[PDB]
Amino acid sequence: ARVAVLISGTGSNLQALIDSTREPNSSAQIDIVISNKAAVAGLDKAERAGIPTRVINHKLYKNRVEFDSAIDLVLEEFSIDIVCLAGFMRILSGPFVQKWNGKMLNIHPSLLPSFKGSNAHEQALETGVTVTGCTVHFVAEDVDAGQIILQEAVPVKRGDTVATLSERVKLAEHKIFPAALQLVASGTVQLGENGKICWV
Ligand SMILES: Nc1nc2sc(CCCCc3ccc(C(=O)N[C@@H](CCC(=O)O)C(=O)O)nc3)cc2c(=O)[nH]1
Numbered sequence: 001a002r003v004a005v006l007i008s009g010t011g012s013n014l015q016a017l018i019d020s021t022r023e024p025n026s027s028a029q030i031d032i033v034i035s036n037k038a039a040v041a042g043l044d045k046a047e048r049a050g051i052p053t054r055v056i057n058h059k060l061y062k063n064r065v066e067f068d069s070a071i072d073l074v075l076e077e078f079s080i081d082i083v084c085l086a087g088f089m090r091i092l093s094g095p096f097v098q099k100w101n102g103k104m105l106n107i108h109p110s111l112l113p114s115f116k117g118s119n120a121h122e123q124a125l126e127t128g129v130t131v132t133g134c135t136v137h138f139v140a141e142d143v144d145a146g147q148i149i150l151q152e153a154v155p156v157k158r159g160d161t162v163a164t165l166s167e168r169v170k171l172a173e174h175k176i177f178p179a180a181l182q183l184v185a186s187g188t189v190q191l192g193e194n195g196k197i198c199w200v
């Protein structure tokens with residue numbers, strides 16, 4: 001399966017995906033890394049790994065659909081099968097999400113359905129949970145509302161901040177995101193016609 005990773009920041013999940021997909025038994029190959037920000041560590045990790053890169057600036061497109069269309073064009077040029085959102089901090093349009101239904105994964109730093117949205121660690125800390133985690137899911141039109149592929153629980157420790165909790169959750173993210181990509185790329189997990197998740 002040919003994989004595109006879309007990034008926006010440091011790309012520690014990108015690095016985890018690079019590491020696992022280079023293993024001999026990987027059913028996925030990362031063929032392109034796409035960023036909406038042109039000076040991010042993620043781009044450098046891709047270049048270090050010999051992966052082509054492309055930067056798409058919203059400042060050249062009139063709307064989301066136009067911008068996602070630019071992404072989609074690069075995906076088609078690279079004959080991409082699967083899209084991983086790895087710290088990608090834009091919201092995707094309906095048609096783009098519709099087109100990639102069942103073929104786009106996202107990593108979210110909470111145990112969904114808890115703490116949907118942008119500041120999941122702050123939400124978890126304000127709520128007082130003692131257990132949080134991360135979730136790999138298929139991307140649906142409702143943000144953080146697609147089918148769940150894998151999750152991993154992570155303890156919250158007294159005195160945690162966004163800094164320390166995100167650090168601990170990310171170790172978990174670096175495990176389930178590669179596993180999830182491997183499950184989808186091998187066809188072991190798929191989105192069934194009923195929109196439910198199938199283990200084959
Ligand atoms: N179509 C589609 N596109 C996308 S992109 C993606 C990865 C994450 C992108 C960054 C992001 C993700 C979510 C939010 C957000 O909702 N913020 C709320 C917080 C809500 C609350 O507090 O409860 C607020 O601003 O208030 N902001 C930025 C997932 C996804 C998806 O599932 N569907």
Ligand SMILES: NCC(=O)N[C@@H]1O[C@H](COP(=O)([O-])[O-])[C@@H](O)[C@H]1O
Nearest residue numbers: 009010011012013014086087108109
């Ligand atoms: N659902 C959106 C969201 O909050 N994404 C979060 O952004 C970070 C990117 O880290 P990375 O650049 O080290 O992969 C990840 O920790 C991920 O949980």
